[PDB]
Scaffold this motif. Structure first.
Motif, PDB file in Angstrom:
ATOM      1  N   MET A   2       0.816  -1.206   0.000  1.00 20.15           N
ATOM      2  CA  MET A   2       0.000   0.000   0.000  1.00 20.15           C
ATOM      3  C   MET A   2       0.863   1.276   0.000  1.00 20.15           C
ATOM      4  N   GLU A   3       1.930   1.302   0.809  1.00 28.29           N
ATOM      5  CA  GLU A   3       2.838   2.477   0.844  1.00 28.29           C
ATOM      6  C   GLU A   3       3.367   2.785  -0.596  1.00 28.29           C
ATOM      7  N   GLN A   4       3.796   1.734  -1.315  1.00 28.22           N
ATOM      8  CA  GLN A   4       4.313   1.865  -2.680  1.00 28.22           C
ATOM      9  C   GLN A   4       3.322   2.561  -3.591  1.00 28.22           C
ATOM     10  N   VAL A   5       2.033   2.266  -3.432  1.00 30.64           N
ATOM     11  CA  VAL A   5       0.944   2.974  -4.167  1.00 30.64           C
ATOM     12  C   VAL A   5       0.764   4.467  -3.751  1.00 30.64           C
ATOM     13  N   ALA A   6       0.863   4.723  -2.433  1.00 36.63           N
ATOM     14  CA  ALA A   6       0.856   6.099  -1.843  1.00 36.63           C
ATOM     15  C   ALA A   6       1.992   6.961  -2.408  1.00 36.63           C
ATOM     16  N   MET A   7       3.212   6.396  -2.364  1.00 37.97           N
ATOM     17  CA  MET A   7       4.435   6.950  -2.949  1.00 37.97           C
ATOM     18  C   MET A   7       4.251   7.304  -4.431  1.00 37.97           C
ATOM     19  N   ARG A  10       2.030  10.166  -4.929  1.00 33.51           N
ATOM     20  CA  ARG A  10       2.879  11.379  -4.735  1.00 33.51           C
ATOM     21  C   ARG A  10       3.763  11.695  -5.974  1.00 33.51           C
ATOM     22  N   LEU A  11       4.595  10.748  -6.422  1.00 29.06           N
ATOM     23  CA  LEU A  11       5.253  10.837  -7.742  1.00 29.06           C
ATOM     24  C   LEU A  11       4.295  11.236  -8.875  1.00 29.06           C
ATOM     25  N   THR A  12       3.075  10.705  -8.850  1.00 32.06           N
ATOM     26  CA  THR A  12       2.083  10.992  -9.883  1.00 32.06           C
ATOM     27  C   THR A  12       1.585  12.405  -9.754  1.00 32.06           C
ATOM     28  N   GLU A  13       1.387  12.861  -8.536  1.00 29.83           N
ATOM     29  CA  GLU A  13       0.909  14.232  -8.352  1.00 29.83           C
ATOM     30  C   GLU A  13       2.005  15.270  -8.657  1.00 29.83           C
ATOM     31  N   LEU A  14       3.235  14.937  -8.301  1.00 33.06           N
ATOM     32  CA  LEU A  14       4.401  15.773  -8.595  1.00 33.06           C
ATOM     33  C   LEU A  14       4.534  15.914 -10.102  1.00 33.06           C
ATOM     34  N   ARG A  62      11.118  12.592 -20.292  1.00 37.96           N
ATOM     35  CA  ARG A  62      11.449  12.173 -18.925  1.00 37.96           C
ATOM     36  C   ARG A  62      10.252  12.336 -17.969  1.00 37.96           C
ATOM     37  N   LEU A  63       9.626  13.493 -18.022  1.00 46.23           N
ATOM     38  CA  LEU A  63       8.470  13.830 -17.229  1.00 46.23           C
ATOM     39  C   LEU A  63       7.412  12.753 -17.365  1.00 46.23           C
ATOM     40  N   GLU A  64       7.060  12.384 -18.594  1.00 39.71           N
ATOM     41  CA  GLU A  64       5.959  11.433 -18.818  1.00 39.71           C
ATOM     42  C   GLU A  64       6.319   9.978 -18.486  1.00 39.71           C
ATOM     43  N   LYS A  69      12.194  12.656  -9.839  1.00 39.39           N
ATOM     44  CA  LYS A  69      11.880  12.247  -8.414  1.00 39.39           C
ATOM     45  C   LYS A  69      11.525  13.422  -7.501  1.00 39.39           C
ATOM     46  N   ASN A  70      12.079  14.595  -7.799  1.00 38.06           N
ATOM     47  CA  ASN A  70      11.818  15.827  -7.034  1.00 38.06           C
ATOM     48  C   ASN A  70      11.972  17.022  -7.964  1.00 38.06           C
ATOM     49  N   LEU A  71      11.463  18.185  -7.531  1.00 35.43           N
ATOM     50  CA  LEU A  71      11.648  19.479  -8.236  1.00 35.43           C
ATOM     51  C   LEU A  71      13.095  19.858  -8.566  1.00 35.43           C
ATOM     52  N   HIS A  72      14.025  19.569  -7.667  1.00 33.43           N
ATOM     53  CA  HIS A  72      15.437  19.870  -7.886  1.00 33.43           C
ATOM     54  C   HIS A  72      15.934  19.196  -9.177  1.00 33.43           C
ATOM     55  N   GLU A  73      15.563  17.952  -9.406  1.00 37.56           N
ATOM     56  CA  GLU A  73      15.965  17.249 -10.644  1.00 37.56           C
ATOM     57  C   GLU A  73      15.476  17.962 -11.904  1.00 37.56           C
ATOM     58  N   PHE A  74      14.220  18.384 -11.878  1.00 34.86           N
ATOM     59  CA  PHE A  74      13.581  19.112 -12.934  1.00 34.86           C
ATOM     60  C   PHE A  74      14.252  20.456 -13.170  1.00 34.86           C
TER      61      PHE A  74
END
Length: 121
Positions: A2-7, A10-14, A62-64, A69-74
């Protein structure tokens, strides 16, 4: 798990947030100077100059693939687009001036994005 889906939610919302940010940055490049990779057929020496090419289409792939993984990478990739251009092209060129304008204008969008990534989590 379940955590992996939550994560992944979050990745999906980011990814959702970064897509919007990417669209906003790209609107500040109406000329489309930064839309596609620099052509090595048309600039065959380009890789002698620039070690890590970047462009909005490459960032979008990359985005799609949820590869940020985070804003800094972007932001790193966005700063490559700018920084490569200001090194390769001289100060007096349309290209270099477009990169300055993209940088200045992009700054406002990125400032609010950072607050939204922190704020939403």
């Amino acid at each position: 798990s379940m955590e992996q889906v939550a994560m992944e939610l979050r990745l999906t919302e980011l990814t959702r947030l970064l897509r919007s940010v990417l669209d906003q940055l790209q609107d500040k490049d109406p000329a489309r100077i930064f839309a596609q990779p620099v052509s090595l057929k048309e600039v065959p020496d380009y890789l002698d100059h620039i070690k890590h090419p970047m462009d909005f289409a490459t960032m979008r792939k990359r985005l799609e693939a949820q590869g940020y993984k985070n804003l800094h990478e972007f932001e790193e990739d966005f700063d490559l687009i700018i920084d490569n251009c200001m090194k390769y092209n001289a100060r007096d060129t349309v290209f270099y001036r477009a990169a300055v304008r993209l940088r200045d204008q992009g700054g406002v969008v990125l400032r609010q994005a950072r607050r939204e990534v922190d704020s939403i989590g």
